[PDB]
Amino acid sequence: VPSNATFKNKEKPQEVRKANIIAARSVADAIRTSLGPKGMDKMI
Amino acid sequence: VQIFGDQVTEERAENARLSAFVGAIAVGDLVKSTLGPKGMDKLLQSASSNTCMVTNDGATILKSIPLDNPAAKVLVNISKVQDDEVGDGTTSVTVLSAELLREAEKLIDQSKIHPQTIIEGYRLASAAALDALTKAAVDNSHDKTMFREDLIHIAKTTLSSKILSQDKDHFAELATNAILRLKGSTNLEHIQIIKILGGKLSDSFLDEGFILAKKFGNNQPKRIENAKILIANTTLDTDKVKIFGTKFKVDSTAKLAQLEKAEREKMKNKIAKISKFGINTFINRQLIYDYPEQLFTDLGINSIEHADFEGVERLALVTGGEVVSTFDEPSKCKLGECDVIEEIMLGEQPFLKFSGCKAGEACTIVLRGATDQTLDEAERSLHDALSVLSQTTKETRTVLGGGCAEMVMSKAVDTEAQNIDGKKSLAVEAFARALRQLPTILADNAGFDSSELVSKLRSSIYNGISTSGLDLNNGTIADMRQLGIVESYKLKRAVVSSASEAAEVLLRVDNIIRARPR
Amino acid sequence: VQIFGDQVTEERAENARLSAFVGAIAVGDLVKSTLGPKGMDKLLQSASSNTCMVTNDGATILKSIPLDNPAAKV
Amino acid sequence: ASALLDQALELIQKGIHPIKIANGFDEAAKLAISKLEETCDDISASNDELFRDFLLRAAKTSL
Amino acid sequence: SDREQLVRAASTSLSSKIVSQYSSFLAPLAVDSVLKISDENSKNVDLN
Amino acid sequence: QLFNNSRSDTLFLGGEKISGDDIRNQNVLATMAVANVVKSSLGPVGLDKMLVDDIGDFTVTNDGATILSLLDVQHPAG
Amino acid sequence: EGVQAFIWQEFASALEVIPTTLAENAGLNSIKVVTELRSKHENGELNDGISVRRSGTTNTYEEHILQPVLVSTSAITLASECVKSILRIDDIAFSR
Ligand SMILES: Nc1ncnc2c1ncn2[C@@H]1O[C@H](COP(=O)(O)OP(=O)(O)O)[C@@H](O)[C@H]1O
Ligand SMILES: [Mg+2]
Numbered sequence: 001v002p003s004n005a006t007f008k009n010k011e012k013p014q015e016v017r018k019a020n021i022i023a024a025r026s027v028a029d030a031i032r033t034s035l036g037p038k039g040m041d042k043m044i
Numbered sequence: 045v046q047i048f049g050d051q052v053t054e055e056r057a058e059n060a061r062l063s064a065f066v067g068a069i070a071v072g073d074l075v076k077s078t079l080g081p082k083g084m085d086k087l088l089q090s091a092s093s094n095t096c097m098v099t100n101d102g103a104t105i106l107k108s109i110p111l112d113n114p115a116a117k118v119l120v121n122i123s124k125v126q127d128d129e130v131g132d133g134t135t136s137v138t139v140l141s142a143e144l145l146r147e148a149e150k151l152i153d154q155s156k157i158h159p160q161t162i163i164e165g166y167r168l169a170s171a172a173a174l175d176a177l178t179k180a181a182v183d184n185s186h187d188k189t190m191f192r193e194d195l196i197h198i199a200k201t202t203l204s205s206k207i208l209s210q211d212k213d214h215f216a217e218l219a220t221n222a223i224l225r226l227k228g229s230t231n232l233e234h235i236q237i238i239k240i241l242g243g244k245l246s247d248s249f250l251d252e253g254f255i256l257a258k259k260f261g262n263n264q265p266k267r268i269e270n271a272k273i274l275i276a277n278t279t280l281d282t283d284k285v286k287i288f289g290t291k292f293k294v295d296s297t298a299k300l301a302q303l304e305k306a307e308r309e310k311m312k313n314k315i316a317k318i319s320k321f322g323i324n325t326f327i328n329r330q331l332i333y334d335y336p337e338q339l340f341t342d343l344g345i346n347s348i349e350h351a352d353f354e355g356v357e358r359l360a361l362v363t364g365g366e367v368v369s370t371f372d373e374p375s376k377c378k379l380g381e382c383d384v385i386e387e388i389m390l391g392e393q394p395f396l397k398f399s400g401c402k403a404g405e406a407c408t409i410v411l412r413g414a415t416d417q418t419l420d421e422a423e424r425s426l427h428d429a430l431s432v433l434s435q436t437t438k439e440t441r442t443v444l445g446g447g448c449a450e451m452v453m454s455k456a457v458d459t460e461a462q463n464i465d466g467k468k469s470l471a472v473e474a475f476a477r478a479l480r481q482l483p484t485i486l487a488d489n490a491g492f493d494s495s496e497l498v499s500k501l502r503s504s505i506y507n508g509i510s511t512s513g514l515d516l517n518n519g520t521i522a523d524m525r526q527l528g529i530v531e532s533y534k535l536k537r538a539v540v541s542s543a544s545e546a547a548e549v550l551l552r553v554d555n556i557i558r559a560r561p562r
Numbered sequence: 563v564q565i566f567g568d569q570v571t572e573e574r575a576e577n578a579r580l581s582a583f584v585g586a587i588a589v590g591d592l593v594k595s596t597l598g599p600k601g602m603d604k605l606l607q608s609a610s611s612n613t614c615m616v617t618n619d620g621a622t623i624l625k626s627i628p629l630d631n632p633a634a635k636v
Numbered sequence: 637a638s639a640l641l642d643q644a645l646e647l648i649q650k651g652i653h654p655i656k657i658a659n660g661f662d663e664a665a666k667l668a669i670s671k672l673e674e675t676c677d678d679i680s681a682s683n684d685e686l687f688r689d690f691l692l693r694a695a696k697t698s699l
Numbered sequence: 700s701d702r703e704q705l706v707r708a709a710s711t712s713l714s715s716k717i718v719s720q721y722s723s724f725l726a727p728l729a730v731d732s733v734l735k736i737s738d739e740n741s742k743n744v745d746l747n
Numbered sequence: 748q749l750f751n752n753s754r755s756d757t758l759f760l761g762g763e764k765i766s767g768d769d770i771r772n773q774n775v776l777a778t779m780a781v782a783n784v785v786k787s788s789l790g791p792v793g794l795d796k797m798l799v800d801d802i803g804d805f806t807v808t809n810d811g812a813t814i815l816s817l818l819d820v821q822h823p824a825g
Numbered sequence: 826e827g828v829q830a831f832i833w834q835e836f837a838s839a840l841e842v843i844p845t846t847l848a849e850n851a852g853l854n855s856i857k858v859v860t861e862l863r864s865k866h867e868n869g870e871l872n873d874g875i876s877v878r879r880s881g882t883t884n885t886y887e888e889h890i891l892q893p894v895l896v897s898t899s900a901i902t903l904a905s906e907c908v909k910s911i912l913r914i915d916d917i918a919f920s921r
């Protein structure tokens with residue numbers, strides 16, 4: 001059950017995908033406050 | 045004594061080499077994860093302009109990433125040459141050329157073999173590998189039914205690694221019909237690719253006729269039935285008089301008023317010669333002024349201006365006519381006919397659509413995607429698929445893919461390795477194990493154990509069955525004839541030839557002299 | 563979010579497993595030619611006083627040569 | 637601890653007050669301890685011969 | 700062409716826009732603009 | 748007000764982005780800073796103000812139309 | 826009965842962010858609304874939604890609140906195609 005089959009290598013892509021999701025959800029949080037009739041305008 | 049100068053980096057002997065081996069390992073590991081249908085795409089961020097690109101092609105990755113290693117550029121150039129001559133397999137060439145050095149790294153180290161002796165091992169191994177791959181090829185184009193079916197299997201194999209792999213089932217017919225309409229002429233200038241935002245990837249449809257984005261004249265109607273299409277090389281513009289090199293000498297303004305009127309009648313007489321053809325549609329290569337445009341309204345002639353150099357030949361072949369310059373003789377330059385010139389709109393930009401033309405010698409592909417990162421890859425995904433399908437028209441020899449081709453070539457290498465006396469026999473067996481690294485990575489990127497799949501595939505071919513291959517969906521050994529995996533012989537021959545020659549260059553480098561950068 | 567302070571080098575990925583194995587290769591290749599009766603001695607250049615030391619033993623060679631790689635310190 | 641914070645971040649985005657999240661973890665902590673306390677058994681009834689075996693069992697796990 | 704379905708959908712699509720309070724006369728404005736171009740083929744209705 | 752907020756944590760912006768009540772607080776201070784001028788100039792009992800271009804010339808303007816025109820305000824809401 | 830089914834459970838819960846945001850921006854409690862949303866949407870086939878004027882759950886058709894189908898259809902399609910493109914990035918390399 002252990003020690004057999006295969007072992008995962010180069011686990012950085014697992015962290016790269018996490019860094020891409022966290023950075024994308026951070027952008028979606030600022031625009032989330034503008035959703036619906038109760039949303040607010042964003043001055044840039 | 046330092047003869048070279050200040051700030052001159054040089055490595056010699058064991059320092060000179062192992063700079064080329066680490067260079068191939070660093071370059072090979074970048075495209076190692078992109079090999080196979082389960083491979084992962086790599087994102088490239090530019091140091092300036094903040095431009096990002098998502099690409100699965102091993103050639104486009106090596107061109108964007110700056111590399112100061114002289115041996116790294118060796119693997120970059122072979123990826124461009126493989127992209128120039130074929131366009132597919134650029135990732136496999138970089139990996140296979142790197143695995144030849146990884147095996148040769150232990151040959152000089154563990155077995156203590158001279159580098160030139162290893163070169164003689166690849167020469168005898170590559171000669172036997174190309175002979176076994178040629179005999180495994182199957183003749184094509186003898187039957188028009190089998191020729192069309194083989195092109196569908198090639199498009200499914202190339203697009204398997206692309207992001208199109210989900211929708212490639214519907215895209216196999218998209219890329220196949222574009223090649224059959226070329227009538228044997230191989231060019232990608234006749235195939236147009238338009239990017240559109242919105243929808244889904246599978247919404248991409250094949251264009252009947254030729255579609256090119258243009259705009260009608262101000263007073264010209266959108267839809268004309270049975271319109272005649274003509275393309276003119278000459279542009280309607282102020283020509284001076286004839287030879288240029290002149291200016292008017294006006295003694296009195298009484299003749300100056302009739303002088304400008306004479307220039308208005310010159311372009312008016314040129315349109316009168318065009319109206320002798322009875323055309324309902326006119327196409328110009330460059331911008332048309334408003335003065336000649338009004339002459340097309342009274343004559344019922346459509347106008348298309350600002351045509352690109354590629355758009356001139358794409359439109360002329362679909363309609364069947366040829367580009368007219370002098371307009372003098374009406375009998376020459378017989379013109380085709382288009383059924384529907386009515387313009388449609390895809391997205392926020394209207395696209396002029398044609399239907400029911402005489403010839404399909406040129407094609408147009410419409411692509412729809414969510415972001416430009418997908419559209420940038422969707423164009424390069426079909427560009428690699430249409431390149432192999434276009435080369436398959438002239439080159440009919442095809443072989444089985446799916447990791448089977450690399451294993452069949454390695455079978456003949458181990459057969460002739462037993463009859464080769466000397467230390468160069470170890471370099472011959474190293475070429476066979478290097479061919480097994482390509483199907484090994486196919487299992488690693490798919491999440492399956494490579495030691496189990498390669499061992500079952502290696503022992504199955506020695507039993508006399510050459511149709512066995514790797515199935516990544518079920519994670520077992522399956523037949524390539526049933527799964528429909530077919531690749532062209534020119535594709536696999538270019539991978540083995542380019543990788544074997546690239547590894548020979550870096551094994552011949554005993555010194556590296558780096559001049560001071562400018 | 564970076565929990566570590568400034569000028570803190572860490573490798574959580576393939577770069578760590580690569581640096582650990584290659585770090586032992588340079589250590590093994592240094593004392594490789596010193597194994598056997600046909601081996602050759604090594605020269606040590608001192609950073610102070612310019613005192614040269616020539617020894618075939620691998621214990622003095624590894625302790626005298628500074629090594630910042632933890633894989634080498636093992 | 638980080639697993640409790642990962643599940644709490646999802647509850648904060650839903651509009652739950654952080655104190656209401658902490659109040660739920662305190663009540664759920666005593667329910668888990670009281671449940672596992674009833675499942676375990678007392679090994680003190682064994683003699684000194686068997687008591688040494690239980691010490692060898694937990695030793696190999698921590699090693 | 701339905702004045703009940705188009706106007707109520709145009710004012711609802713405004714939502715948080717600053718014109719929501721001005722949507723009284725603006726909702727028939729966007730409806731009557733599209734109704735001037737009618738086709739049975741459901742063309743994209745160019746906004747030029 | 749108070750202490751400056753952290754700069755783009757996980758947000759990865761090249762500029763400065765502040766959220767919460769700090770924006771509406773600075774927006775009020777933008778209108779209150781420009782009001783204290785116009786305030787004392789209102790009514791018959793109001794007094795004129797003198798604006799200087801640093802080049803040696805002065806400008807006496809009672810109403811806030813030219814005052815706000817001459818004074819450079821870089822605040823977006825100001 | 827598969828690992829693909831376990832992913833679909835998170836796909837349905839991911840769409841709840843839109844009605845949750847409507848309550849957060851309006852000051853109402855999201856769970857108190859969703860608790861009423863799950864009960865009313867079980868018997869009712871459609872038109873049950875959140876109304877910002879009445880601050881609660883009521884019939885959106887009687888309130889005239891309506892949106893085209895192409896707005897919601899493209900929102901689900903474009904979101905699924907973007908997630909597929911993001912999850913395929915295994916690394917980010919500096920280029921020229
Ligand atoms: N559907 C499939 N099943 C099994 N193997 C495949 C499949 N599609 C592609 N391959 C293998 O992946 C390898 C790489 O294919 P391709 O992407 O065309 O070249 P590259 O990866 O060099 O761009 C090929 O050698 C082929 O054997
Ligand atoms: Mg390919």
Ligand SMILES: [Mg+2]
Nearest residue numbers: 696697698699
């Ligand atoms: Mg422990």
Ligand SMILES: [Mg+2]
Nearest residue numbers: 711712713714
């Ligand atoms: Mg809206």
